[PDB]
Each structure stands twice: as structure tokens, then as C-alpha cells.
Design a binder for these strands. Structure first.
Length: 416
RNA sequence: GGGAGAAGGCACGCUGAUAUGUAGGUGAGGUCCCUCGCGGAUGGAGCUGAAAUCAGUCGAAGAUACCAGCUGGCUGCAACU
């Protein structure tokens, strides 16, 4: 706040959020958001609620972003999938950053194609199914083309905003946009909670217990994320071997979390994808089957909570194992002549680190599972609104902690 | 040539550093050359590894056991194995 350098970046990010907000408050022409918002009040609109949380609340308002930034993440999932399966992309990836720019371009183009396909499916399928129940506009090719091009331009401009915040400002664009979109719904929730509290509909003690529990979860997950296991190693004697004296790290820190919201968003996309594709048909055979299997996975249902929990565990474990590389560490200790008591340098050192991280990231994922599990049972028992949900809290905490970590990192780098 | 191992004396363990194993010994990967091979040069990862010096430490005793010359002076005879 004091430094002007970070101040300009802050004003840039905030301003970007302003532009994004104004752009998100503009509904699609020929679409009434009132009947849509009225439709979400039923049980058939509860299944799309979880998908609405990642749209920044622009889904109910029928803004220029239908799916939000989700198709970009899904596009990244598809790109990584083709990278794992097809060796052709893997070869290009090994050609250096020059091929990484190609993977980039193909990821953006894939995002474009997915945006087009999803625009077509959504706009054509759901409204025109009854048809013309929610929309007055006739099911013609004009409305189709209009909706397609509109959602394409919207998603493209959104990606542009994501690139601008990432480049000309601190932190990730997608991260801060999703974060802002999530925390934007908190003040109306609190306001409506207070207004209904004086009506006798909601008890004050309940809200107090909710707030206290939220603060407790906060303090807890903050305490956990900064928790780490350090490996003590004393090296080295005999100063004329051209390695010592260090003047280096006397201990190797090991963090439970990376940390990032990427596994959470990815897992969210993966789990919600079958729920998203089945939510396009409200009536007909979709009501008899697709709507049923859409009710199979619900934020209020324990099954979806357990499945999403397992997804969180798997994605977080895989990501944590992917980011941290014991090879580079072992090579770093080898070139410096570090000898671990405990050990002998080689491949045996890499197996030890993996052995520790396997017993670490596991119980860490168990902790995250618990933290994600509590607010659902709290929502069932205390009847708290959906803005207090566990996923949103996790996203907020991760985003804030990681952003502040990056800030302190930049301040430490600029210091010495 | 010998006599001579003459006689007589000195250090000797362990641990650390000089060097997280040195001097040497071996010689991978790589790059180059080739009359292209079980080739040549470069190359130094890994592996092996004395000796010494300095500092410390235990014990009455460090060639701690088994192992492993008694030595010197005069003379007879036979040169010698």
C-alpha cells in the first residue's frame, strides 16, 4: 500500500475488476433474466447453483459470460489430456518454449472452439426445448448466431482480461477474477441475513456460531498451510574440498501445500462436467434420467461431497507430487557436495523425499477433506446460505494466502 | 665383497584436519579423429588407496596376542657351501 509500484498494480487489478463487473452486469439482448432467476428458485435450479458460483453470479443475470472462465480451464484439461495421450504434442513440448507457445495458441484456440460448441448447445438446446418458455425470441438461426458470437466475444474478452491482469499486474487474472466474483455475493448474503434476523426468521446465536466457526476454519487452514517439515542436515567439514563453507540452506523445508487453487478448479470442472452436460435438458427424457442423475450429484447431497472430496485428494496429491521435483533437489545437493546424515547422495535420496511426501500430502489431503466436509453439514444443520459453502471458502483462503505469499516473495526479492 | 642385522637408539594405538579419501592406481559418460575398430586422442564421473605432518584422546603398557635374532671380547682347528 505504501509503495507506489505495488499501488499501480493494485489500481490496475481493481480497475480490471471494475471493468469486468460492468461487463458482467450487461445481460444478453433478447433474454429475460427475471424468469431465469425465478426458475432457479425451484429444485431444478439448485443443480446449476454450483455451476453458477464459478460464473461470478453472471449466469442468473444472463451476462456475456455463460460458463465464465470454466471453458478455459476445461480446455487446459483437454490440452493436458492430449499431451498425455498423443506423443505428438509431447514432442513439441520438449522442443522448448517455442513449442510451449504453440501449446499456448492451441489452448486458446481450443478454448475458442469449446466456447463455440458450448454456446451452441446451451443457447439452442435449453431455451427452445419447451420451446420459447423462458424466451420470447423465436427459435431461429438469428438467435443462435447472435448468442454464439456474443458468448464467443465475451469469453475472448474475458481471456484478454485474464491476460492483462497476469501480465501488467500481480497474481493470476483467472484467480483474482474468480475470487472477486465469489466474494461479490457475500455482502448481499450478509445483508439479507441481518435483515431476516430481525424478522425472527433467523436466530442471532446461529449466525454468531456460523461466524465463529468460519473464523475457526480460517485460523485452522492458515495454521496448516504454513506448516512444514524441515530436514536437518549438517555439512560439511573440511573446508578445502572447494564446496564449503555454507553460506547456504542448513535445512530442507517440505510444505504440505504448493499452494494453488488449480487442483480445486480442475477437479471442480471434472466433477461438474457431467452435471453440466446433463443440465441442458430440463424436460422430456432429460427430466426422467438426466435430471435424476443430476440430482445424484448435488452440493446438498453427501455423495457429491464425498466424490468432490476424493477429487480434491487426488488432484492435490498429483499436483503436489508434480510440482516438487526430488531430482533437481538431489542434483542441487550433489553439485554443492551436501551429505545428508540420515544418508548417502544418489537416487536413494529421491526415494526418501517421495517417502516423506507420500505420508505428508496424504494426511494433508485428509485435513483439506475435513475442512471441505464441515461447512456442508453446517449448512444442513444451521441452514446457512450457499455463499458460506466450503468450496468458496477454500478458494478464497487459497487465493488470498497464495497472493500474499507472492507479494511477500516479491518484497523479499526486492530487498536482498 | 665384507665384518654388519655389528653394537646402540628413536617413532609405532585410536580419532580429526591438511584432503567430508590426499599422492598414486584404474578409467565410465562426452567431444574430436579414423587406414571405422577388440582403434587413436582428448576427457575426467565413479572406484580404489599408501605414506606423512599437525592437533586431540585412552591405557601401567599400542611391533599390546600368536608370531618373531641374545650380544660382545680372546683364542685352537678346518678356508669356505
Amino acid at each position: 500500500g505504501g509503495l507506489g509500484e505495488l499501488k499501480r498494480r493494485l489500481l490496475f487489478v481493481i480497475g480490471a475488476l471494475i471493468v469486468f463487473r460492468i461487463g458482467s452486469f450487461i445481460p444478453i439482448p433478447g433474454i429475460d433474466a427475471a424468469v431465469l432467476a425465478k426458475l432457479l428458485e425451484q429444485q431444478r435450479g439448485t443443480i446449476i447453483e454450483m455451476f453458477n458460483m464459478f460464473s461470478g453470479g453472471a449466469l442468473s443475470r444472463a451476462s456475456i459470460f455463460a460458463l465464465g472462465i470454466m471453458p478455459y480451464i476445461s480446455a487446459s484439461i483437454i490440452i493436458q489430456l492430449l499431451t498425455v495421450v498423443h506423443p505428438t504434442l509431447a514432442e513439441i513440448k520438449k522442443e522448448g518454449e517455442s513449442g510451449r507457445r504453440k501449446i499456448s495458441q492451441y489452448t486458446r484456440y481450443g478454448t475458442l472452439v469449446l466456447a463455440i460448441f458450448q454456446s451452441i448447445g446451451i443457447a439452442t438446446g435449453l431455451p427452445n426445448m419447451p420451446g420459447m418458455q423462458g424466451l420470447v425470441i423465436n427459435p431461429g438461426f438469428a438467435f443462435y448466431f447472435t448468442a454464439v458470437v456474443s458468448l464467443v466475444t465475451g469469453t475472448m474478452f474475458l481471456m484478454w482480461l485474464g491476460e492483462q491482469i497476469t501480465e501488467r499486474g500481480i497474481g493470476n487474472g483467472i484467480s483474482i477474477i474468480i475470487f472477486a466474483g465469489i466474494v461479490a455475493g457475500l455482502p448481499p448474503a450478509i445483508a439479507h441475513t441481518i435483515e431476516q434476523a430481525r424478522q425472527g426468521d433467523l436466530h442471532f446465536l446461529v449466525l454468531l456460531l456460523v461466524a465463529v466457526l468460519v473464523f475457526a476454519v480460517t485460523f485452522f487452514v492458515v495454521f496448516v498451510e504454513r506448516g512444514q517439515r524441515r530436514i536437518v542436515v549438517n555439512y560439511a567439514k573440511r573446508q578445502q574440498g572447494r564446496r564449503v563453507y555454507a553460506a547456504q540452506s542448513t535445512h530442507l523445508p517440505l510444505k504440505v501445500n504448493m499452494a494453488g487453487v488449480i487442483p480445486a478448479i480442475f477437479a471442480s470442472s471434472i466433477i461438474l462436467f457431467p452435471a453440466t452436460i446433463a443440465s441442458w435438458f430440463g424436460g422430456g427424457t432429460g427430466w426422467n434420467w438426466l435430471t435424476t442423475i443430476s440430482l445424484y450429484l448435488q452440493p446438498g447431497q453427501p455423495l457429491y461431497v464425498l466424490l468432490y472430496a476424493s477429487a480434491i485428494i487426488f488432484f492435490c496429491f498429483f499436483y503436489t507430487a508434480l510440482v516438487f521435483n526430488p531430482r533437481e533437489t538431489a542434483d542441487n545437493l550433489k553439485k554443492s557436495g551436501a551429505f545428508v546424515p540420515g544418508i548417502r547422495p544418489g537416487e536413494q535420496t529421491a526415494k526418501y523425499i517421495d517417502k516423506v511426501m507420500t505420508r505428508l500430502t496424504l494426511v494433508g489431503a485428509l485435513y483439506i477433506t475435513f475442512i471441505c466436509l464441515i461447512p456442508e453439514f453446517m449448512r444442513d444443520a444451521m441452514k446457512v446460505p450457499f455463499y458460506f459453502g466450503g468450496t468458496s471458502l477454500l478458494i478464497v483462503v487459497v487465493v488470498i494466502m497464495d497472493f500474499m505469499a507472492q507479494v511477500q516473495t516479491l518484497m523479499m526479492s526486492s530487498q536482498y
